[PDB]
Amino acid sequence: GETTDGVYRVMTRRLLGSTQVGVGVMQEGVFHTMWHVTKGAALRSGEGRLDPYWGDVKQDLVSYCGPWKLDAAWDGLSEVQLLAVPPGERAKNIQTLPGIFKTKDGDIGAVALDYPAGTSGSPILDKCGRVIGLYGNGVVIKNGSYVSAITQGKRE
């Protein structure tokens, strides 16, 4: 299958036609996406199979073919870009200044951008083009709008 580094759509043919259920990142031969997109199922790339290697429901992350490789972190000061890959639409960079989720275990950056659910897994990048996390696990606030955490894994 295709193993070139980049952003990919995650599709299924189980529902009507071909439906985009999410997005992911190929980096260093490992495919990275959010757990809720695939539920840990195996994936196809052409005639090749990608098997899950690591996953965690609470972090809402999963890696295929190898361990989680993404280790860049939001600096807490600068604007970032969401590389949004919406269903049926071209990949588009959106620049924004993250807010913050404050939790009992520490603070996390958060992005207040609204997209269809099949956009989950789209990467958030810093100014060097490094992936600082994935978009698609978050909350609905007072006005009905969406705010996603910047979810990042740990590179062992």
């Binding site: 990919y8 599709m11 809720h36 994936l43 196809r44 609470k58 990949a91 807010g99 951008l113």
Partner: protein
């Protein structure tokens, strides 16, 4: 049966559309990976 399709390179775009606010929210994360607002 799920499959993947390439959609692009991962690169920063100079002069991309700039939008979105920067809210500071108190949140909780449960064992099922769901975030909730704490008030």
């Amino acid at each position: 049966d799920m499959y993947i399709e390439r959609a692009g390179d991962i690169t920063w775009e100079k002069d991309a559309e700039v939008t979105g606010n920067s809210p500071r929210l108190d949140v909780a994360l449960d064992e099922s990976g769901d975030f909730s607002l704490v008030e």
